[PDB]
Amino acid sequence: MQRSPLEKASVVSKLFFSWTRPILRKGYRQRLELSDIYQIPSVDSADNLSEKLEREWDRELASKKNPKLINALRRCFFWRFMFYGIFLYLGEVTKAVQPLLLGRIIASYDPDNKEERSIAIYLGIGLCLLFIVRTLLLHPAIFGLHHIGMQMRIAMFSLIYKKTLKLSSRVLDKISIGQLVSLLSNNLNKFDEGLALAHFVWIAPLQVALLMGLIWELLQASAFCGLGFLIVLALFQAGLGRMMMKYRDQRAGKISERLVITSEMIENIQSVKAYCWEEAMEKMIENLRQTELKLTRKAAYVRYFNSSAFFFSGFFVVFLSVLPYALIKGIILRKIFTTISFCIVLRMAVTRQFPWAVQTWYDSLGAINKIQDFLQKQEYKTLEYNLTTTEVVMENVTAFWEEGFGELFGTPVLKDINFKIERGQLLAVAGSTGAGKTSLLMVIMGELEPSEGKIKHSGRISFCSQFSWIMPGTIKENIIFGVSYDEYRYRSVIKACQLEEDISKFAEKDNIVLGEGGITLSGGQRARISLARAVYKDADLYLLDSPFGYLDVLTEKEIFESCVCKLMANKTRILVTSKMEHLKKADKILILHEGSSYFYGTFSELQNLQTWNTYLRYITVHKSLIFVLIWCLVIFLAEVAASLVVLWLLGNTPLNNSYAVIITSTSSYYVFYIYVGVADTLLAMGFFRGLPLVHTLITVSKILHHKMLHSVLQAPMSTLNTLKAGGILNRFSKDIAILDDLLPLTIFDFIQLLLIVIGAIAVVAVLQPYIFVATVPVIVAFIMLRAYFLQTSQQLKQLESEGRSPIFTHLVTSLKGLWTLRAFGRQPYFETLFHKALNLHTANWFLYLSTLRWFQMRIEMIFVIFFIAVTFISILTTGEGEGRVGIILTLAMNIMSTLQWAVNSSIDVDSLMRSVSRVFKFIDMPTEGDIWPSGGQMTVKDLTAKYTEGGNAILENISFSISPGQRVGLLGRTGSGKSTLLSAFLRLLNTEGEIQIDGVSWDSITLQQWRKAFGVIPQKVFIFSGTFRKNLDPYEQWSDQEIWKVADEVGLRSVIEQFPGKLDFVLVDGGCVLSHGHKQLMCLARSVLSKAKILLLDQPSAHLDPVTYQIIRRTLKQAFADCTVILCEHRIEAMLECQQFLVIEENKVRQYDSIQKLLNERSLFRQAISPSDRVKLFP
Ligand SMILES: Nc1ncnc2c1ncn2[C@@H]1O[C@H](COP(=O)(O)OP(=O)(O)OP(=O)(O)O)[C@@H](O)[C@H]1O
Ligand SMILES: Nc1ncnc2c1ncn2[C@@H]1O[C@H](COP(=O)(O)OP(=O)(O)OP(=O)(O)O)[C@@H](O)[C@H]1O
Ligand SMILES: CC(C)(C)c1cc(C(C)(C)C)c(NC(=O)c2c[nH]c3ccccc3c2=O)cc1O
Ligand SMILES: [Mg+2]
């Protein structure tokens, strides 16, 4: 890493921004090298800005009765804020005094021998000094203010991430990810750039006050009659401002709901593709955009009138000001041109600078109120007593989940429970699905607080969750989990948990970079890593929430006898399990039932008891847009044509006539200057040109999102395992919101300003030729410097834009794995790990931000340099009477003012046009591409399975044949390939060979038509946010009576009746309200509804007990009558049902007819079988 060149730099270098110069020269010739990206300055790091504001916020919490976050921000930013404000004031004041100096220099070309001709040179000197001071006075203050705004945002972002880790288990149900992601995605670039515009609240009034006097000098009565029109217009904009904000709050609720649906479906797309929910998910996301875009359009139409106010005002402010003075006294052109020059600044001050400044203050404080509201919430309390006899004691405990019934005190999940545990013995927590076994562990950890009862143990605890969580990184980084490495400990664990088999198969042996969640691995592999993490941790208590769910019996025995009873000796360790073998070796047993202790004692006792392309493609999405743009241009040509013949008549005039005083001399060089002043209004886009342009540009973003969401869903699996969670969630949140909100109007201003320049030059050029020639040398200078700047700016903007993903990627996983982070207590790791992601983004954003102010300053300096040259050539060459050089040049330089604004607008479009470029990359992804399934017989021949293209072959030369209406068992060691074989049928991963069904092959039919033959039950369960009926059939093909007629057989009768809205209860946080057992029965019903003749079952009974399993076989015997079944199961009770068996090992298959033969070969796998299951197989 290279250190910041800002650190060591002279006042000149910092003032003129010469320290940014290297990266432009480096970026112009070549592609940007990672080496060239400088380290962030020491001032604005994540640690310091956290440390500073954290201290000031707890001080605010400690002192005041009702604390406010703005008070905390005030005491560490206000002086440096106000320090730049006084410079930004003086830099703005100097724009208001330019008309006085320039106006005289213009008047000094007049043949009539005025005093001006005396002072002209002194004004010539002074006006040059007037420009030089402003250029140096404005830009540093803006960068200074941007730099403060960046520090403010980083400081809060860090306090949100510290706060969110200490947040209560009660609150997590209410606040989804969409709440957090939107809050950060909104403020990310908007807040930083804002603090430039913030000050103009108090700059604009003093500017109006200053300007009004200078006008009052010229026009005594009418100036106030003018101002009145702007006071009327200012209130109209304040009206639109309040109206626009109300549309934004109605929409904000809908965006949060779309992101949680969009996240969930892409997070586990492998299930979405298996069930064939493309039409379902697209229609669901489509319906949420209807409400959103309605409120976007209404917000967009209002903002047009706010934006357009400046351009229309121009003519009317001057007209109402000159007209009264004209009638009573009579006016000179000089007097008209001087008022025009004051009015341009006065409008800019009151019409664009004033309403933008206020709108920023609403957004900032609005944002700070949400953060302050988020910071003062219910926190997870800690009450650990390290003093103990290492005796984990529980007595007379009851607990309710929701606040209502618990506070009022529905049945509690635990009641009248008690147990004592000595150190050096394991507890067997047994019961049926929904007994409260997880709920019991949640009370011990203290995530679920008890209403009545008392807990006490030592603070040190270890936890193994039922849903296995893999943070992004290496298997080592997962197993050690943010502590020092130990060769003797690490190796003894992996051998005890026996991952040595699975780790050795991978190319990079130990350390492979696992994605968000670890979908690279299988169900059994994740569980053993989750276990290894819990084992490697040292603590007084080890909680294990059924880690033998996805493991085969041979592995389940070996790991239980090699880890739990060997490596974990002389420790209290409460275990969730439902097998006789585990309860036999166990010391004390606890059998829960309907949240009540059915039995408590010992096992002995229990038995005794009972670039051009990107711009072009965007325009040619929607055909309306190209018609509207042509329709604007033909009307533009008409108004350019209209002004031409007006000025042709006006200039050709042959002129008691007190209305307007003109003479041959004055006429020539004021009539044209007046036109350039009022050109902004004459060429302005009226509601007819404005509204449809805005309307279509929103309709484009609607079409672009549909294609993008459509293309992502039907892309191949390999491409979707490449990209991250935060990478998907970045675009759909931030880069779709840019095409809806910012881009539609940033274009309008760019077009509006571009037309005004062209049309003004055109009319002036056609009428007087030399001005066109005079502009060219200034025109080329801006286009030259623009083409030079963008070569660096474009490349920086992509690094910064793709530099966001790390912040989101981390925020997703952190939240999902929150319960283990607090179990182990690893917040200090994750905070410092999160600080990096902000620093990375700061390093790219700060660099892009600083490079801009260079271009902003240089473009102004180019103008100043040319103006200084123009003015001296004007004044010095001035003849004795009618000097016809300075006239022509200054008129050009009066246009280049409008162009300088258009070039700055042209950069603001290009930066937002990076968003649409990154959207098209997601649209341009590759694509995976009599009654038919009669009997359902399959024929596999020379099949090969691999995930990556040209990688390791998981299965090789596979070939077997199933007969019609036959049940087939599938089995093998954890990580054999059992899932890969089931995925090979649906052909999700890329394969070679052919699987032919009922004498018809793959290549004879389409994929989406092929996949509607199979009814799947995947290994990982997918429950999106919605109602039960929606989760049971998204297409809504079946009736309520039909769903109820299925619900009884799978036995969700009692499960649903618990909740208030029967089949209308909206599930949240990926269906966290249901227990692990009910999620398996949810997938079962979903398959029972979808009446298929072939169906695949990737381990139906994962964590189901022998009682609940009776439902699986009951529904498998009755409902699935004549259809062919491929049953991939670990429990041995399931093997009684199916006839043929497939065994996978050594990347190959073995088919068998009888169970007795299969078990006869493998002695170890036969000895593994439970005594209670052994009597069933062998009579
Ligand atoms: N966050 C929650 N909010 C509301 N109810 C919940 C929540 N978590 C669990 N429950 C409910 O509490 C009961 C017990 O759930 P718990 O997960 O403790 O059961 P379990 O015995 O661990 O089940 P399994 O055998 O499936 O693992 C169930 O009825 C479940 O729906
Ligand atoms: N998405 C993937 N990308 C790369 N390799 C993968 C992927 N999924 C699985 N594998 C590899 O294939 C092996 C077999 O995984 P698979 O899920 O088919 O096994 P399984 O027998 O179904 O496991 P389980 O006992 O957990 O059900 C894994 O151990 C891993 O090495
Ligand atoms: C009839 C005709 C000539 C097509 C026409 C009419 C108007 C109205 C009626 C809106 C003044 C306008 N005016 C506008 O479109 C205006 C657009 N934005 C504004 C913002 C603030 C204040 C006024 C306007 C405005 O008049 C323009 C026209 O070209
Ligand atoms: Mg459970």
Ligand SMILES: [Mg+2]
């Ligand atoms: Mg599997």
